[PDB]
Amino acid sequence: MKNDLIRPNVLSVKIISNVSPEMAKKLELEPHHKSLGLITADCDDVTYTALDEATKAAEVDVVYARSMYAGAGNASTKLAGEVIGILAGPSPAEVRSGLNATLDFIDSGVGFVSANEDDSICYYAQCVSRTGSYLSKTAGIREGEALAYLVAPPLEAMYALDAALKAADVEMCEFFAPPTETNFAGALLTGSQSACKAACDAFAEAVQSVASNPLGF
Amino acid sequence: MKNDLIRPNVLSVKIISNVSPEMAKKLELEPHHKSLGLITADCDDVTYTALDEATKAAEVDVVYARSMYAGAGNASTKLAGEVIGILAGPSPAEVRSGLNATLDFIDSGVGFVSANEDDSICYYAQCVSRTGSYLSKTAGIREGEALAYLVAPPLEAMYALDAALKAADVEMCEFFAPPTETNFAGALLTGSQSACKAACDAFAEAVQSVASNPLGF
Amino acid sequence: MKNDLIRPNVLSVKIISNVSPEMAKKLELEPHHKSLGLITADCDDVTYTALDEATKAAEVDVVYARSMYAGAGNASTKLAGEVIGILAGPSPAEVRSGLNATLDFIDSGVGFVSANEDDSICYYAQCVSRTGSYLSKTAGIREGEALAYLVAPPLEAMYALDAALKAADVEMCEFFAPPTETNFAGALLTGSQSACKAACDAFAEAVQSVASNPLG
Numbered sequence: 226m227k228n229d230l231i232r233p234n235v236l237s238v239k240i241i242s243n244v245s246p247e248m249a250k251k252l253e254l255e256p257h258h259k260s261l262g263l264i265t266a267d268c269d270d271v272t273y274t275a276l277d278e279a280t281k282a283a284e285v286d287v288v289y290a291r292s293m294y295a296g297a298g299n300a301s302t303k304l305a306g307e308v309i310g311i312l313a314g315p316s317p318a319e320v321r322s323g324l325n326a327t328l329d330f331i332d333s334g335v336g337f338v339s340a341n342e343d344d345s346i347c348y349y350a351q352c353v354s355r356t357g358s359y360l361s362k363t364a365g366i367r368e369g370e371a372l373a374y375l376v377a378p379p380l381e382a383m384y385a386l387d388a389a390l391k392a393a394d395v396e397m398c399e400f401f402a403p404p405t406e407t408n409f410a411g412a413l414l415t416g417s418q419s420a421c422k423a424a425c426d427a428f429a430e431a432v433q434s435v436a437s438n439p440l441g442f
Numbered sequence: 443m444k445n446d447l448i449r450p451n452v453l454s455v456k457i458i459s460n461v462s463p464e465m466a467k468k469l470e471l472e473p474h475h476k477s478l479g480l481i482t483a484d485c486d487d488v489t490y491t492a493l494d495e496a497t498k499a500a501e502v503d504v505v506y507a508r509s510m511y512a513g514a515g516n517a518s519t520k521l522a523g524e525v526i527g528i529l530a531g532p533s534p535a536e537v538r539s540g541l542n543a544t545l546d547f548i549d550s551g552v553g554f555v556s557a558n559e560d561d562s563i564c565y566y567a568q569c570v571s572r573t574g575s576y577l578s579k580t581a582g583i584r585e586g587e588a589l590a591y592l593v594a595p596p597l598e599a600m601y602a603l604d605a606a607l608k609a610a611d612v613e614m615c616e617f618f619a620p621p622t623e624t625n626f627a628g629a630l631l632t633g634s635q636s637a638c639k640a641a642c643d644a645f646a647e648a649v650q651s652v653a654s655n656p657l658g659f
Numbered sequence: 660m661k662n663d664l665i666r667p668n669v670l671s672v673k674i675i676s677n678v679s680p681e682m683a684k685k686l687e688l689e690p691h692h693k694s695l696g697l698i699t700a701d702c703d704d705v706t707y708t709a710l711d712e713a714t715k716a717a718e719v720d721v722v723y724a725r726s727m728y729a730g731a732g733n734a735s736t737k738l739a740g741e742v743i744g745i746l747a748g749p750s751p752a753e754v755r756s757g758l759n760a761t762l763d764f765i766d767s768g769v770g771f772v773s774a775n776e777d778d779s780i781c782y783y784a785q786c787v788s789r790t791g792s793y794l795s796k797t798a799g800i801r802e803g804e805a806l807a808y809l810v811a812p813p814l815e816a817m818y819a820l821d822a823a824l825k826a827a828d829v830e831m832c833e834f835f836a837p838p839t840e841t842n843f844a845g846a847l848l849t850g851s852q853s854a855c856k857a858a859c860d861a862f863a864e865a866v867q868s869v870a871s872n873p874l875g
């Protein structure tokens with residue numbers, strides 16, 4: 226149903242202690258990165274936000290984060306979901322803390338929102354009031370600055386991004402050119418906290434407008 | 443059933459009348475691109491051909507055109523389909539003219555053709571007599587020159603491209619190495635309008651030949 | 660159920676006896692490559708292993724080898740599967756010999772193994788005791804040297820790879836960073852024949868451990 230919250234789900238979580246030198250080399254780990262926290266979920270962008278949140282809550286870095294082709298609905302195995310994230314830290318304790326902070330955020334109430342009756346169209350419009358070390362890097366902005374995290378299907382995203390850019394004083398920092406691996410699109414926008422929030426609102430409304438009138442132009 | 447035309451479908455269309463400066467920068471639009479025309483459909487190569495036809499009928503450029511991973515049958519949302527196209531033009535009126543030309547072409551009888559009983563194998567063998575600005579650029583040929591637009595699943599495409607090249611007086615312009623995002627493959631071949639038609643016929647026959655005998659060397 | 664062999668299947672095979680120069684150029688064929696052997700199947704890594712076996716059986720080279728997005732289960736057409744491979748040789752006879760070695764290997768009993776009751780988790784832990792020209796080049800090792808060919812879903816793969824590297828004296832040759840086109844991951848590890856086998860065993864064990872306790 227419209228405006229329903231699509232609940233994201235963690236599918237698998239694992240810890241590597243004393244990561245082997247070979248794997249550390251290929252993941253380009255730092256010298257202090259001795260432990261890894263692995264996580265997969267059925268929603269990549271919520272997970273990406275949760276991972277960034279973890280870097281604030283613990284002494285961990287996001288060293289690896291990638292989405293799966295064609296999304297979670299097209300997963301061929303149980304634990305693949307549509308995202309894998311890897312946190313790196315100095316110890317299993319810190320990594321566990323990072324994963325816990327990640328899990329807490331994923332179940333915090335954030336998520337994609339339905340734009341129609343059968344939830345065949347959904348979107349993400351999340352204001353990050355204070356970015357951690359991951360999403361700030363990704364956006365090419367200063368750590369601690371705010372972001373509007375906007376995601377929707379390709380056409381809806383392009384249409385809604387333009388509405389968001391017009392609704393407030395925000396800069397497009399990173400463009401998720403369609404298709405992402407999951408066949409979505411969108412962007413990270415930056416500005417004041419209230420400006421980012423203003424962008425999120427305009428984005429949500431614009432997506433809903435397209436959903437209710439796909440062929441009208 | 444074999445030789446049945448598979449009807450392509452448009453899923454969504456929208457017009458942005460005054461693109462924001464931020465969006466124009468990420469799409470690398472020219473200063474004279476003021477309006478955008480967005481379109482999604484369940485068949486990418488038909489849409490690409492339609493978008494190219496639009497550049498001939500109106501003052502519009504194809505500034506964006508991408509396929510979705512794993513094709514329309516695997517779409518996770520209602521309007522994603524397997525392609526997004528973006529026309530850029532001087533005004534909403536001119537963009538609408540371009541979009542109308544696009545929609546007319548998609549509904550003109552072109553499309554993928556079934557190669558077997560249950561339509562589990564299909565191919566695209568379209569002769570573009572006079573390329574617009576988009577496919578000509580993509581093929582690296584002059585606007586107004588002819589193309590054989592040939593697409594099939596990976597093995598069929600490789601087998602049938604070879605047959606088309608031998609059967610007709612054409613040359614290779616652009617190779618769609620398997621897999622495309624939709625897990626197809628093919629090529630754009632150029633030559634006389636007659637030669638391109640001959641390439642299409644030989645391509646189609648060769649794909650059907652593989653469908654009827656997939657395991658025979 | 661668990662430990663069941665997931666049977667791999669060839670979907671299509673064709674020979675191009677005399678490849679056109681236009682296609683030869685685009686595939687970057689060697690000047691002596693005149694014939695192509697095309698093959699598709701519903702399991703990419705088995706086919707890659709099989710194609711390597713072909714290079715030992717006939718005068719053929721692997722000139723093309725790609726996986727399909729989202730795997731065989733999401734194929735939109737009958738013969739696409741999740742892999743296309745292309746052998747190139749000086750004659751149709753060499754390609755035929757190559758393709759037949761490929762077919763026989765795929766049907767030899769090799770394949771992904773199931774990790775749980777509904778086979779919703781599977782993995783590949785193949786010990787290649789004697790690499791041909793294809794996987795040897797890909798791994799950056801000498802032809803004839805052994806490989807551990809390890810593949811599993813993203814998290815299982817990363818976890819099991821670490822276990823494998825610790826379980827035996829092996830070096831990482833190529834990393835299949837998640838996702839591959841099929842949304843899998845893994846690596847090629849090298850070492851002695853026994854060292855690679857131990858890595859396969861540790862990998863398989865580690866994947867099954869995750870399957871039976873994913874969240875924990």
Ligand code: B12
Nearest residue numbers: 679680683688689690691692693694718748749750751753
């Ligand atoms: C077919 C072929 C072969 C066949 C020849 C036998 C046969 N009947 O099939 C085989 C597979 C044996 C072969 C081998 C080699 N060849 Co050869 N071969 C070709 C090819 C594809 C076509 C020859 C042809 O039809 N020529 C045209 C017709 C009109 O002439 P022809 O006189 O009847 O052809 C004869 C000679 O070309 C000859 N031959 C073939 N290769 C070579 C190489 C050398 C150095 C010499 C002296 C003769 C020779 O055998 C042909 C008999 O049909 C060409 C590339 C091309 N598209 O032209 C390469 C080509 C001639 N080969 C080449 C090479 C490098 C080799 C090898 C060194 C490959 C290797 N093993 O490392 C060896 C040479 C030693 C040997 N003969 O085993 C190069 C030669 C360039 C140079 N450096 O002078 C070419 C030009 C390929 C390239 N790199 O572009 N070859």
Ligand code: NA
Nearest residue numbers: 298299516733
């Ligand atoms: Na699917």
